[PDB]
Ligand binder design. Structure first.
Ligand SMILES: OC[C@H]1O[C@H](O[C@H]2O[C@H](CO)[C@@H](O)[C@H](O)[C@H]2O)[C@H](O)[C@@H](O)[C@@H]1O
Ligand SMILES: OC[C@H]1O[C@H](O[C@H]2O[C@H](CO)[C@@H](O)[C@H](O)[C@H]2O)[C@H](O)[C@@H](O)[C@@H]1O
Ligand SMILES: [Fe+3]
Ligand SMILES: [Fe+3]
Lengths: 192, 192
């Protein structure tokens, strides 16, 4: 049914911020496993012919954990880039300034939400229904995609498999890696 | 203030099932961090004079997450032993045979609960109010210590940091490691 998407860049393209070995396990094993599991759960069910987002927004239990993780990881890979990092640009830079006053205050606010997102989790930059940006944390497979009117803009995976190989227990060091890779083109594409 | 308990065995005593590197990060860094963080949170609350278990059973939020994780890890180190593994003995073996019919059926049941305990979690062997054994899963820092009438007997930490260095994504391989280390003396002590 579903297929694991290709990575949007070569396996060593995020070096030295996220390693090749991390992409091999994170994309090639964890993301793949969610796709295999969902496909095993859907045959001959009321989800067998629905799109992935349709499944994510209409399931619970194991179907939801697997489908939402497939979606969350594809969004995460797009949130990184070997040509990303550095200062934000375009409409998202201005929207960040409108909410937090400055990019540095936004980065401090997102780092604080990410470091403190307890357990397996995701930290998201979203555009609320009212048009403003905000930072929100979700646990396990939960995702702002299920929230009517909220538009996911970027995400950082904080499950330990996302960073343990490269950074062990030090999330702030992984977050420095993330800021060096953040894909402002994808953020702007989602914001607009 | 609280202190990080010593490990009950040498750093390489669980080799080759859990590595020295895993114990250095897992005990020396993760377990330690929960101790430091709790020792920041307590003062100025109705907690600074309470024992660890008293805090675990009457707190929520960050105090609970750090205090429950300190308790859960100390319980987890005691659940392993370089002289453990193999068939269960004593009262716990008999109780296992009473609930599941055989040790092999128990192991299959616990393995299924642990492999499928989604996200950061713990799988516990507990003794119920009625005297029977059961397997229960908790998420993040939740623990049966807070359930009236339930007595924790053994635990397996399923947060990814407990096994990623040694086994990466393969929980079943980590669980084989756990069966080779399970401390039946601690289980029997807790059961009696
Ligand atoms: O996909 C199997 C089940 O996964 C979840 O439940 C598992 O993980 C929980 C922690 O996130 C545990 O509490 C639970 O015991 C496990 O079975 C999901 O919640 C279930 O609905 C799925 O069927
Ligand atoms: O210890 C600080 C807070 O930790 C928890 O909240 C963090 O982790 C949650 C995921 O488990 C996130 O949803 C949340 O946004 C983070 O702040 C705890 O639940 C809070 O009560 C603590 O203050
Ligand atoms: Fe992930
Ligand atoms: Fe742990």
């Amino acid at each position: 049914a579903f297929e694991l998407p290709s990575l949007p860049y070569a396996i060593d393209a995020l070096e030295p911020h996220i390693s090749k070995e991390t992409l091999e396990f994170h994309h090639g094993k964890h993301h793949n496993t969610y796709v295999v599991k969902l496909n095993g759960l859907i045959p001959g069910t009321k989800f067998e012919n629905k799109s992935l987002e349709e499944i994510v927004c209409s399931s619970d239990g194991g179907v939801f954990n697997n489908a939402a993780q497939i979606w969350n990881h594809t969004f995460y890979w797009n949130s990184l880039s070997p040509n990303g990092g550095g200062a934000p640009t375009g409409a998202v830079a201005d929207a960040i300034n409108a909410k937090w006053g400055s990019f540095d205050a936004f980065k401090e606010a997102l780092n604080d939400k990410a470091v403190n997102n307890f357990g397996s989790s995701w930290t998201w930059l979203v555009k609320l229904a009212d048009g403003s940006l905000d930072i929100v944390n979700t646990s396990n497979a939960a995702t702002p995609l299920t929230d009517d009117g909220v538009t996911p803009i970027l995400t950082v995976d904080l499950w330990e498999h996302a960073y343990y190989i490269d950074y062990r227990n030090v999330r702030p060091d992984y977050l420095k890696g993330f800021w060096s890779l953040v894909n402002w083109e994808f953020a702007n594409a989602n914001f607009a």
